[PDB]
Amino acid sequence: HNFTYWNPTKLIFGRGEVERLPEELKSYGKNVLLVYGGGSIKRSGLYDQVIEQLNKAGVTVHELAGVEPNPRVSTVNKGVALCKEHHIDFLLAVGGGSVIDCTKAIAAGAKYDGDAWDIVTKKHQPKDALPFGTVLTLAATGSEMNSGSVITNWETKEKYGWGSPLVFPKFSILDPVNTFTVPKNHTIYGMVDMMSHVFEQYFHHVSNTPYQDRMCESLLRTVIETAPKLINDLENYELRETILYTGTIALNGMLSMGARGDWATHNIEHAVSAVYDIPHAGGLAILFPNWMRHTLSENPARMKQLAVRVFGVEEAGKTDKEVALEGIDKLSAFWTSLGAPNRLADYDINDEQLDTIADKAMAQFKSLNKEDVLAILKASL
Amino acid sequence: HNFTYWNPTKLIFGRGEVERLPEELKSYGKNVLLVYGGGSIKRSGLYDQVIEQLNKAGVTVHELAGVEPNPRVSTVNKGVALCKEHHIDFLLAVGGGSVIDCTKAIAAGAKYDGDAWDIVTKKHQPKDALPFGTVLTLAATGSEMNSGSVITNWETKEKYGWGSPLVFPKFSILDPVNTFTVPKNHTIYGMVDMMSHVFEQYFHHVSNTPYQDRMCESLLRTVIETAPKLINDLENYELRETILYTGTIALNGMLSMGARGDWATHNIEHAVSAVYDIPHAGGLAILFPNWMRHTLSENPARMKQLAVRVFGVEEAGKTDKEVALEGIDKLSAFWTSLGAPNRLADYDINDEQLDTIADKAMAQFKSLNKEDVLAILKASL
Numbered sequence: 174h175n176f177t178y179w180n181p182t183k184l185i186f187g188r189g190e191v192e193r194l195p196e197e198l199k200s201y202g203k204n205v206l207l208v209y210g211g212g213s214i215k216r217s218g219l220y221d222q223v224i225e226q227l228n229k230a231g232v233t234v235h236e237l238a239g240v241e242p243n244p245r246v247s248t249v250n251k252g253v254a255l256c257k258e259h260h261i262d263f264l265l266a267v268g269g270g271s272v273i274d275c276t277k278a279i280a281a282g283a284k285y286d287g288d289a290w291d292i293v294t295k296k297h298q299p300k301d302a303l304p305f306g307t308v309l310t311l312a313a314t315g316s317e318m319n320s321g322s323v324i325t326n327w328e329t330k331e332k333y334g335w336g337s338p339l340v341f342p343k344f345s346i347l348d349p350v351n352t353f354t355v356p357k358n359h360t361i362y363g364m365v366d367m368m369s370h371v372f373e374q375y376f377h378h379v380s381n382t383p384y385q386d387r388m389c390e391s392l393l394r395t396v397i398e399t400a401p402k403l404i405n406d407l408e409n410y411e412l413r414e415t416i417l418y419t420g421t422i423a424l425n426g427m428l429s430m431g432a433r434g435d436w437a438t439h440n441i442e443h444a445v446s447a448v449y450d451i452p453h454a455g456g457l458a459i460l461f462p463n464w465m466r467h468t469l470s471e472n473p474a475r476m477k478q479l480a481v482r483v484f485g486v487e488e489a490g491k492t493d494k495e496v497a498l499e500g501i502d503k504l505s506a507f508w509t510s511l512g513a514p515n516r517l518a519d520y521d522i523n524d525e526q527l528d529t530i531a532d533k534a535m536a537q538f539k540s541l542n543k544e545d546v547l548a549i550l551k552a553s554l
Numbered sequence: 555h556n557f558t559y560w561n562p563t564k565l566i567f568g569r570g571e572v573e574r575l576p577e578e579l580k581s582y583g584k585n586v587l588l589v590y591g592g593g594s595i596k597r598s599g600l601y602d603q604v605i606e607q608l609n610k611a612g613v614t615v616h617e618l619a620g621v622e623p624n625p626r627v628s629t630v631n632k633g634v635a636l637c638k639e640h641h642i643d644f645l646l647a648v649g650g651g652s653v654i655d656c657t658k659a660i661a662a663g664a665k666y667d668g669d670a671w672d673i674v675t676k677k678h679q680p681k682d683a684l685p686f687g688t689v690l691t692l693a694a695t696g697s698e699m700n701s702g703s704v705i706t707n708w709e710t711k712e713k714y715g716w717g718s719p720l721v722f723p724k725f726s727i728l729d730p731v732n733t734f735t736v737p738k739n740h741t742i743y744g745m746v747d748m749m750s751h752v753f754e755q756y757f758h759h760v761s762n763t764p765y766q767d768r769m770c771e772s773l774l775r776t777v778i779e780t781a782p783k784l785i786n787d788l789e790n791y792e793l794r795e796t797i798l799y800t801g802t803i804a805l806n807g808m809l810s811m812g813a814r815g816d817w818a819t820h821n822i823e824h825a826v827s828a829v830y831d832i833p834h835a836g837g838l839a840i841l842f843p844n845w846m847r848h849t850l851s852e853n854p855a856r857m858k859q860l861a862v863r864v865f866g867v868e869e870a871g872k873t874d875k876e877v878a879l880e881g882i883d884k885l886s887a888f889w890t891s892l893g894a895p896n897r898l899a900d901y902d903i904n905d906e907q908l909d910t911i912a913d914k915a916m917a918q919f920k921s922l923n924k925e926d927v928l929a930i931l932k933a934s935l
C-alpha cells in the first residue's frame with residue numbers, strides 16, 4: 174500500500190458545516206443509527222444540532238451512546254443488535270477515533286452473522302457493510318477518511334486493528350468549532366497521533382518523492398509551532414482550524430494508504446492499551462521515541478533529515494547519528510513540553526506485566542521479536 | 555464546492571505501475587473499451603504494455619483510437635456506439651486530458667439514449683455511467699482524478715465543460731516514465747494548467763486556511779523551479795517525477811472540488827479553442843494573466859501575497875497594487891521564459907473573429923460581460 178493513494182471519503186470543511194447533513198443524507202436510507210461517546214457532544218451543544226439536522230433530513234433516529242475510548246467489542250456487538258432491531262440503513266458517527274472506529278465495526282458487523290470479534294481478528298473478511306458518515310469532534314486520527322478500525326476485547330485484554338475498503342466513511346464533516354471542547358490531554362494526543370502518521374510515511378524506504386518529503390517536513394513544523402499556542406488557548410478558532418486542517422485535508426497530499434493504515438504497525442502501543450486502557454497516543458508518546466532509538470537505521474539519513482529540517486538541529490561538529498538521535502530527543506522533548514507522558518510510570522505502570530505485554534504484542538528489515546519489544550518496554554518505564 | 559474536498563479515485567504512483575492493471579481490473583467486467591489518442595502511446599511502447607496487461611487480466615479488448623486534442627463529440631458518439639455494439643463493461647483511458655475527458659463522455663453517453671452533446675451542454679444530467687480507469691501519459695490536467703470533462707463540437711465551434719460524480723475515474727495509474735515522451739510544448743502546457751488550478755483555489759474568497767495558502771505557495775514555487783530544468787532535459791526521471799507528483803497527489807492536500815471543477819471558469823479559453831483548436835493551456839498562457847489584470851481585486855491582498863511569497867517581488871517603495879500587478883507580470887514572464895505563447899498572434903490569430911469569440915464565451919462579484927471579454931481578447935492580441 175506504500176505506492177497507493179486512496180481517500181474516497183467526501184470531506185466538508187468549515188464553520189457550521191453540520192448543516193450539510195440533510196444534503197449528504199438525501200441519497201441514503203431513512204433509518205439512521207447515531208453513534209457517539211460518553212456525553213461530550215451533549216455538553217458542547219453538538220448533539221442538539223445533529224438531532225435538528227436529522228429531523229430536517231426526515232430520518233428516523235435511534236442511538237448508540239457511550240462508546241468508550243479504546244472501543245470495546247461488546248459495544249460493537251450492541252450496535253450490531255440495534256441495527257437489526259431498528260432496520261438501520263445508515264450510521265452517523267459523531268465523535269473521535271474511538272466512535273468512528275466503533276461505527277466501522279458496527280457497519281461491518283451488521284452484515285455478518287457472527288460475533289464482530291471475528292472481523293477484528295480477521296477470522297471473517299467483511300463482504301458487505303452498512304454505509305456511514307462522520308462528524309469529527311477531535312483532530313484527528315484519520316479514521317474519518319481511512320478504512321481501518323482498532324477494537325479492544327477487554328475480557329481477553331486484546332486490541333487489534335483491521336480494515337476493509339467497505340468501511341471508508343462516505344462523508345465526513347470537519348468543523349473546527351466541533352473540536353473546541355476537546356480537553357488538553359486529548360488535544361495533545363490528537364496531535365501526537367497526527368505527527369506519528371507523518372513519521373510512518375516518511376520512514377518508508379524509497380517510496381517518497383523529494384517534494385513529498387518537503388510536504389511532510391512542513392506539516393510537522395506547522396504542528397510543532399501551533400501546538401504550544403493551542404494548549405494554552407483551547408477555544409481559539411484559528412489554532413483549532415490549523416490543527417484540524419493539517420490533520421485532515423493536508424495529509425491527503427502526502428500520506429500513502431500504507432501510512433493511513435499504520436494501525437498495523439503499533440503492536441506495542443496496542444498491547445499496553447489492551448492491558449491498561451491507556452490512550453493510544455499516550456502510548457505513542459511513551460514508546461514511539463524509544464522504538465525509533467531501538468531501530469534507528471545505520472544509515473540515519475531519513476531521521477537525520479527530520480532532525481535538521483524539522484527540529485532545527487545544527488549538524489556542525491556532530492556525527493550524522495548524533496544529529497539523528499538529537500532529533501528524536503527533540504521530538505520527545507517537544508511532546509513532553511505540551512504535557513504528553515514520557516514514561517510508563519506516568520500512567521502508574523510498572524514492570525510487573527512487561528512479559529505478558531510483549532507476548533501480546535508478538536501475537537522485513539528491522540522487524541521486532543519478543544526481546545526487542547521487552548527492551549523497548551524497559552527503556553520506557 | 556469551495557468547502558468540499560472529494561477525490562475518490564484510487565491513485566497508484568510509481569515506475570512500472572501499469573503492472574497493477576490486472577489487480578485493479580479484477581473488480582470489473584471483462585468487456586473493455588481501450589481509448590487512446592493519435593499514436594504516441596504506440597511509439598513509446600506503452601500500448602504494447604497495456605495490451606499485455608489486458609491479456610493477463612483475461613479481458614476482451616476493443617479499441618477507440620484517434621481521440622484528438624480538444625476531443626470532438628463525434629468521437630464520443632462513436633465510442634458510445636462501440637459500447638453498445640460490444641456490450642462494454644468498463645473503459646480504460648490511456649492518454650492525456652483529452653483522452654480521459656473523452657472517455658468520461660463515452661462512459662456517461664453509454665447510459666443515455668440521445669446525442670452525447672446533450673450531456674456536454676448540460677441539457678441531460680447523467681443518471682448512470684459505465685465505470686472506467688486511466689493510465690496517465692501527460693502531467694496533469696486533473697481529469698485523472700476529478701469529475702469533469704471538456705468536449706468540442708467542431709461543427710458548431712463550441713467547447714464546453716460538464717461534470718458528474720458518476721464519472722470520477724475508479725483508479726488512475728501514475729508513472730513518470732509514461733510522460734517521458736510528452737513533447738516540449740505539451741510539457742509546458744501541462745505545467746501551465748497545473749499552476750492555473752492552484753491559482754483558482756487561491757483566489758477563492760474566505761475559504762483557504764493559512765496553512766493551505768502555504769501549501770499552494772510552495773507548490774507553485776516548486777513547479778517554477780522545476781519547469782526550466784525539465785524543458786531542457788525531457789527524459790529525466792526525477793524531473794518528470796516532481797512534475798507528476800506536484801500535479802497529482804500533492805494537489806489532493808490543497809485543492810477544493812471547486813478548484814478541480816475550474817473547467818467552468820475558462821469560458822474565454824474555451825471559445826478560442828472552439829474556433830481555432832489551440833491547446834487549452836496555450837489559451838491560458840495568453841489570456842489568464844490579462845483576465846487577472848482585468849479583474850484584479852480592489853483589495854489586492856491575495857495577489858500581493860502571491861506576488862511576494864511565490865514570485866519574490868520586493869514590495870519596498872511600491873503600492874500593494876503595483877506589487878500585485880508586478881506579480882502578474884512575473885507570472886507571464888515566467889511562462890514565456892519556458893516557451894509558452896503570450897499573444898494570440900503566436901497562434902496566427904488576429905482580431906477578425908473577436909466578436910464571435912466573445913459571443914461564444916458569453917453563451918457573482920467580478921463576473922464578466924461581453925465588453926469584459928472583448929477587452930481581455932484585445933489586450934491579448
Ligand SMILES: NC(=O)c1ccc[n+]([C@@H]2O[C@H](COP(=O)([O-])OP(=O)(O)OC[C@H]3O[C@@H](n4cnc5c(N)ncnc54)[C@H](OP(=O)(O)O)[C@@H]3O)[C@@H](O)[C@H]2O)c1
Nearest residue numbers: 210211212213242243269270271310314316321323354355
Ligand atoms: N482507524 C485508524 O486508522 C486509527 C488511527 C489512529 C488511532 N485510532 C484509534 O482512535 C482512538 C483514539 O481516538 P481519538 O484520539 O480521536 O480519541 P477518542 O478515544 O475517540 O476520545 C478521547 C476523548 O476525547 C473526548 N472527546 C472527543 N471529542 C471531544 C470534544 N469535542 N469535546 C470534548 N471531549 C471530546 C471524548 O469524550 P466523550 O466520549 O464524552 O465524547 C473521549 O473521552 C484509539 O482507540 C486509536 O486506537 C484509529
Ligand SMILES: NC(=O)c1ccc[n+]([C@@H]2O[C@H](COP(=O)([O-])OP(=O)(O)OC[C@H]3O[C@@H](n4cnc5c(N)ncnc54)[C@H](OP(=O)(O)O)[C@@H]3O)[C@@H](O)[C@H]2O)c1
Nearest residue numbers: 591592593594623650651652691695697702704735736834
Ligand atoms: N477534466 C478537467 O477538469 C480538465 C482540466 C484541464 C484541462 N482539460 C482539458 O484537457 C485537454 C488537454 O489535455 P492535455 O494537456 O493532457 O493534452 P492532450 O490534449 O490530452 O494531448 C496533447 C498532446 O500530447 C500528446 N501526448 C500525450 N501524452 C504523450 C506522451 N507520453 N508522449 C508523447 N506525446 C503525448 C498527445 O499525442 P497523442 O494523441 O498521439 O497521444 C497530444 O497530441 C483539453 O481539452 C482541456 O480542455 C480538462
